[PDB]
Amino acid sequence: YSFKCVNSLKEDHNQPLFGVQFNWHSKEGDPLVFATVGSNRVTLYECHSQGEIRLLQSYVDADADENFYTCAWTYDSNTSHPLLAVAGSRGIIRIINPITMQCIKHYVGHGNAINELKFHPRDPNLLLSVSKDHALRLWNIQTDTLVAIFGGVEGHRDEVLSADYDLLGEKIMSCGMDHSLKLWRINSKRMMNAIKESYDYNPNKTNRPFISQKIHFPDFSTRDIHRNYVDCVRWLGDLILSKSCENAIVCWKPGKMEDDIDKIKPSESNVTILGRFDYSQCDIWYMRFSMDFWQKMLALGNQVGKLYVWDLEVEDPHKAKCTTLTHHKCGAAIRQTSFSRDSSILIAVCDDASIWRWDRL
Amino acid sequence: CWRKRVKSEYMRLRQLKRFRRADEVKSMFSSNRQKILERTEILNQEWKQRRIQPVHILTSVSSLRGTRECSVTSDLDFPTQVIPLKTLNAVASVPIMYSWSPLQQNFMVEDGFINDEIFVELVNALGQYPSDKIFEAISSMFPDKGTAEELKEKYKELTEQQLPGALPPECTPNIDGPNAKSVQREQSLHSFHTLFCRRCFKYDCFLHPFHATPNTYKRKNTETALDNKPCGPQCYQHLEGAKEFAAALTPPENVEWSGAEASMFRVLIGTYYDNFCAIARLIGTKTCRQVYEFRVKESSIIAPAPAEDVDTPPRKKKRKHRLWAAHCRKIQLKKDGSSNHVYNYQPCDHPRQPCDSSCPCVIAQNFCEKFCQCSSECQNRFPGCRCKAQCNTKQCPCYLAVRECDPDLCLTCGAADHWDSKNVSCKNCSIQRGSKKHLLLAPSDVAGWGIFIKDPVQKNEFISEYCGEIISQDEADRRGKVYDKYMCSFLFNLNNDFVVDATRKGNKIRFANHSVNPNCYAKVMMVNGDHRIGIFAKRAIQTGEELFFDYRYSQADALKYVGIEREMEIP
Amino acid sequence: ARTKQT
Amino acid sequence: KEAAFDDAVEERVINEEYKIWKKNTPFLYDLVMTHALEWPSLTAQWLPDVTRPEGKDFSIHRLVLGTHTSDEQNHLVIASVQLPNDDAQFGGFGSVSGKIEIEIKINHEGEVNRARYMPQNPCIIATKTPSSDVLVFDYTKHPSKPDPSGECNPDLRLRGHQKEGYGLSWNPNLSGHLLSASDDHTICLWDISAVPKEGKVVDAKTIFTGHTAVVEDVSWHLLHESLFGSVADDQKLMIWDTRSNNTSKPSHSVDAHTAEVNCLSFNPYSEFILATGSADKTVALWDLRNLKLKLHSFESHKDEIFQVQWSPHNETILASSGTDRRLNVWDLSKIGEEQSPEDAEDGPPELLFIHGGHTAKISDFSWNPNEPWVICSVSEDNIMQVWQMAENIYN
Amino acid sequence: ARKSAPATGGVKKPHRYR
Amino acid sequence: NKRRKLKNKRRRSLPRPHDFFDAQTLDAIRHRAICFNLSAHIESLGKGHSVVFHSTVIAKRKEDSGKIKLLLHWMPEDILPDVWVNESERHQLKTKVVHLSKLPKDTALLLDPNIYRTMPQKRLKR
Amino acid sequence: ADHELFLQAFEKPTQIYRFLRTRNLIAPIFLHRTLTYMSHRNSRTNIKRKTFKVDDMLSKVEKMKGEQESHSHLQLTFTGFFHKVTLEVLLVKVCHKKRKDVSCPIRQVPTGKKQVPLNPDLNQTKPSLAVSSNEFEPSNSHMVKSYSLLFRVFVAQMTVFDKNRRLQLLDGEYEVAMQEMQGPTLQFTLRWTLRIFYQFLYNNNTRQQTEARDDLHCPWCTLNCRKLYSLLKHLKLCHSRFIFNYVYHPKGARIDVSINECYDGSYAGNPQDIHRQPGFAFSRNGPVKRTPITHILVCRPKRTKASMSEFL
Amino acid sequence: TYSSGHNRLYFHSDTCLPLRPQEMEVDSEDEKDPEWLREKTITQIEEFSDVNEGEKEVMKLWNLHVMKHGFIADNQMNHACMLFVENYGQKIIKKNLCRNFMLHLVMHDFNLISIMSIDKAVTKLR
Amino acid sequence: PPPATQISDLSKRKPKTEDFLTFLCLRGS
Ligand SMILES: [Zn+2]
Ligand SMILES: [Zn+2]
Ligand SMILES: [Zn+2]
Ligand SMILES: [Zn+2]
Ligand SMILES: [Zn+2]
Ligand SMILES: [Zn+2]
Ligand SMILES: [Zn+2]
């Protein structure tokens, strides 16, 4: 895939944007809209033909000095409206209704800064947030009930700074500052019961709070993949793609190659390192890669603004060459990237509050 | 001569190996791609079944004038865009709290690329094809290879997984299982004896190391009166042969004597030593006459039951407290002249040697509790309460130094009875019973998270024990370096050997803040052989009042960490 | 390792 | 909608005003004694008795309150407050934590709309119900701790109504005569002097149906045992008289206000003087001899006057509580007298105190006897505050 | 830095009459 | 306390007590303040404590006797009622400055939609 | 400290306090004349031996003195209409505020139809008259707030009776001005039968000197405190969002206004309501349970004198 | 100034969510036997390879019983074994592993229970 | 700048923009 640069925005606050997400829930025909979070500011943009980009909306947390560095899109299943969840240094989640132009929900309770937000692929109401408090919390945005907390005695011992649902939303692979990657299964019996009890709870008819599930023991854990801070994790189907300070995105798999992800035991202590993606000049941490919806291309940027796009449809992406898209006016550290649902457009953000648009072909 | 051939074969075998690995990863990638395609297809089909309302631009409607302006510029020809910027509604923030786990009891815890797969590949690949020359060559050129003697030994060996497997050296499965072969009583009970901790009755003790003396300790065998009574139609007595066998101890039949039944008979006879009626009753697959026959056969095989016991003749009206005080005075005047330190309690066992100056507990300046194997009348042991009232007074011995009331020693104070009821009269059996006061967690003053008391508590009343994970002092320094760099420490010094860390685990009382004038105080008490930290009210505390207790930091440390004193006009 | 920024 | 946004901004500014008043509290009062009841109280009336323990720097008073809950059980509670009888105080200003304790609770068949005690027998208290019946309770016949089983049997119940009521007042002269008014256009009377054979149920003796709208609180004449007033949504005040051989035409009928009139209080110290308050943000007082003429009206409330009560120990002093989150005390001895421009800027001369200590509608209030200037005001936001206006404001 | 508590108090002397 | 020393009003560093008046409400206040200043000129011509009204003639009246009068309408509209003034009032009462306290208390609430609001505007009870 | 930060930090409390200025000038929170430190306001003493047996006598005397006018007859006869076509006239009445509706009930009654020749010439007639009836009875006057009439040829509303039920129309020729809905005019005739300084500080780096004339008045709410002690007390109490320090100045006073970083601007209401989700928070839809608490914020203030030594 | 009662909003220790006033009355949210400790003891017991399946199940159930009831005294283990028989006895028969519990009873070598207690427990299990 | 007409400095900060009455108090530069 060949990409070309058609637009290069620059926000006025001149503060790093650590997050950008395309609205993958929009249908076909309605225009492409994405959100970039940085400083105390959340902005929405629209992508039009011939490189046209339009700044639609902007939200600011003018008090208490919030540093937004996460965003995630969802929809209201009852009323079909979009919703954008943002979180950052304060550890508070703000579900924003961009069509009514107001923050409709807050979720406080994370003991430290939140640096990743994920929405359940099969359930818009279920939201996952990792935080500096060494734990992952699964929130329900229909009823404001915290479904579960992922952490504790066998949870992460340091800042959880990434996680990802598997593509059917049956498990979460979490990575933290403890060089460890941990797997938590939602398809378990207790977690489905937790969702069901979260959907039928209302405080107005009971004197007890919602019984959140404390899940201290993950279904897998490994420190054999990376020797430094693992700052991003995505699911390449059943193979987990993991990224750390070492300049490589490592495609690994729990257990031996004979075992499958469904049958690995919590006590399994071996992994297969079946591939890695080589790049360079990305030593600094909290740089995140993001494959497109179809998981056929993988994008990442380095400290000098070189955007590495890999083709995951090749027979063996281990030896495959990258695209190393770059622009002479770039140079700031790319923070995060996002593809459109059709992946016809690729977007990126930098540490100098700039947004770069790349179009396939 | 043989160097190049061995090198060629090793390169070719490793080439085949990594070619196989590459083909395997190719197949794995292809299968994963197929799974991705299928699942993405079903997700995309799911996404096409609904409608999402498209978001539009915003214009100043509410707060028409006076709002902030948001703009984005472009390096290229596109015009600069300006839109009104709207403020999100404020949300009440919460203080910082890292993850921790609830605990009502302490939790003792302990303190280039290389892999073993390449060594196994070298062993099995070279082992399939004397052979000492190959090992000598592979050790000669390659600096990282060597120990050719072990390679030759492995080549001589089967070089295969010929081990028995998961079965232990003495296979003793569940007795109710179909393969429960007959074994010795110690062999059958070895796991329980090694794993059971007597100090808190937990198998694989959560706060006591398993490296302790097993159940093989001196004990009295006079566990029953050995009253003679007939058992029924089949009995160890009431028959001429049965009576003769019983008299001799103090014909066999081809019954279905399973290995499990024989092992269980051995186990029971190694604990009763005198009564075959009870053993026959407990084992349903045994006849009492056959029980006696097998007992006689086993006695003729190895040995009969010794049934040794002791009576401890010496006694006196005041043989518990006066000599206790004399012994304590002696040990204090010889070595324990000051209370500048306190050691962890560990039971001491001896081969009938007395608890002299060489005793680990006496040299540790600790009284032997019931867990010590010192003696039934060990003069160093703590006897218990004789007080018949509330044990909160400085005149009771157990309360006197720092100790709680042992529920098997202090009988009169009430620390024994009503074990299942909160209504107790000893008032010094609180931290053992977990009689914590209800605490609420809320963002406090002075600091971030602080603990609060629901109902009022009078002075010198117990508040929740400061639980945590018990660690060593070196590990304490290790993790306390990080905690100090984070300016948030939950470390509570327990004794000279251990220390309680409330960071990763604990209870609600871990949030209690510091104040030079506190409403609570903490004392490290000896609780049933364990040092535990109890939080007590320094004065009467009102409902909803925040709990503070002094951290007893050094002046510099106290000022630099917890220097917020909450008051400025105290004088 | 550390240094989130350049 | 814009209404929700205005409500939010109003909540912010109301909180700021409460902060400003709480900061300015010491210079406006000589006693402010706040309490946040676990459930809001629609009723507030001090019991007449006062206990003055020896050597204690306080006295024990009691309240007749209620619980209007969301879903759970409703109770008729009686509080116990400590007031600083001496000049020092009432740790704290007296007992470390004893200032307000609630030890009386009777299960109710609905929220306590109105709760008034019988002057000739304070132990028995009549109370209104959202149901169609009015029930009386004697707290000496019920346990201090409420029975968690459920409903509690009252002393007896009084019927004669068909829907919710708010009006209630006992006869201060005839021992055993009660008055009630409801959303039905009918005011009823009951003879509770002696009903042993009534079987827990006492039917209406006489029903007054003169009004044509929602009848609000009815108050007897303080000194005359046969006359009683009445106010209603008919925007008129009609004064009744018993033993008149009639049930539809009252003794008098004058168009009291321009809006629905919901207030009534005969002056205890005057034979012919009563005061009314209505939704027209005005408090009006008449004279029994000249009902055709309304001789004053107080214009300081902002939304709607809901409770008007006369101050005991003072003939010329009146208090009205409104939905404007303000309780006004009127010294009507200053009606229409000259004032300096900045004096008149604050309000009419008839005004000498605005109680800005509530951030919701003041549901009810009552001056207390045996203490010259202490009021208890309750609001819908669970906040009940016993307060005394500063001494130098009067005298 | 570790939170600390006061040390022991002692053991009762034998009872003896005046 | 009874007579003991009271606690200090400040110390080294206490935890933040939060601020209920957020920046969103402050932006609302700023918008409404600019609107009120543009309309009423409270902080420019009203001396901070008064709102100015501009009079426009609506009706011209000539009486039975030799006298004439004009009807006055005020720019902020319903905040003040229409009055009748003689012919000589022109050029002498074009703009009147009325104190915030002297404004009619019934129509002074129309100056601004936060001067007073019945907070539970929808009442489930009386 | 940047200047913009200083401006924002000092405009945050100024905005709210100046909004409160207006809000409490129209809807007071308390009477400033009843505050102990503005005893100069409300100069009238509290001494009174008032009796209730003379209220009726005084009211009757005043009513008899004021009982001057109790008066109460026209035909339409429509004419032209000045302008540089049909018309109707309506008698529009405004009722009083009710619980049922949030607005004053307004209603009009038809009384006929008219034709108005546009732009009549001078002396070309060969001014219209009104139509009146017994529509102003005292019984109806109690119901309705005021009486008025409406024109439409383009509307013009005219009031006949004031809020105090006082007649304001008299016998004469009127000329009203039309509205878009000089210029379009309708003509008709009818008959009826110490110089004190302030200093603003921020982080000890940004400083502003402001001398405010009309001194002894509160800058934030224009409250008149005739004494300097009263002014300082009002500033510290009513405007506690700043920290004020009184410093002696020749021929005046100096107040060092600085931001109060310790101001407790939290939500004084239910503590739980501040953590509710938007929409459900501050619902006021009904009762809420809350843990009881008792506050004694005033028991018996010492009531010292007006000493200037309280501020240094 | 003065206060009497709960002055602030309280939170849950485990979820950091606000504590409703209805939640304080009948809940301290701290139990003697947390679920994570039960799971930890299960995993720790299964981590050992020398012990057989019956031993693993015995230690499982005994540890769970002891953590639930929190026995701290030697003299309360006769009733502890009785309560184990009454409560978990149906689980032993379902597992058909009674021999390994009776084997657990013989404890007795630690001088914690009487031989009569062993006989009574085994009799009550059947 | 030290002069203030009535409250001019405080009246500068509130309508700092939007072409409000600050046009008459430009002396507070
Ligand atoms: Zn142990
Ligand atoms: Zn020992
Ligand atoms: Zn010993
Ligand atoms: Zn020993
Ligand atoms: Zn004792
Ligand atoms: Zn004891
Ligand atoms: Zn004791």
JSON list of C-alpha atoms and ligand atoms in Angstrom, two decimals, chain B residues 385 387 391 396 398 405 413 426, ligand 5:
[
{"chain": "B", "resi": 385, "resn": "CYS", "atom": "CA", "xyz": [-4.42, -14.83, 82.89]},
{"chain": "B", "resi": 387, "resn": "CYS", "atom": "CA", "xyz": [-7.63, -11.94, 86.19]},
{"chain": "B", "resi": 391, "resn": "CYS", "atom": "CA", "xyz": [-7.87, -7.21, 80.91]},
{"chain": "B", "resi": 396, "resn": "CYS", "atom": "CA", "xyz": [-2.54, -8.27, 84.26]},
{"chain": "B", "resi": 398, "resn": "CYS", "atom": "CA", "xyz": [-0.37, -10.76, 79.54]},
{"chain": "B", "resi": 405, "resn": "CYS", "atom": "CA", "xyz": [-4.41, -13.06, 75.91]},
{"chain": "B", "resi": 413, "resn": "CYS", "atom": "CA", "xyz": [-10.34, -13.40, 81.62]},
{"chain": "B", "resi": 426, "resn": "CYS", "atom": "CA", "xyz": [-11.48, -9.94, 78.26]},
{"chain": "J", "resi": 5, "resn": "ZN", "atom": "ZN", "xyz": [-5.80, -10.97, 81.70]}
]
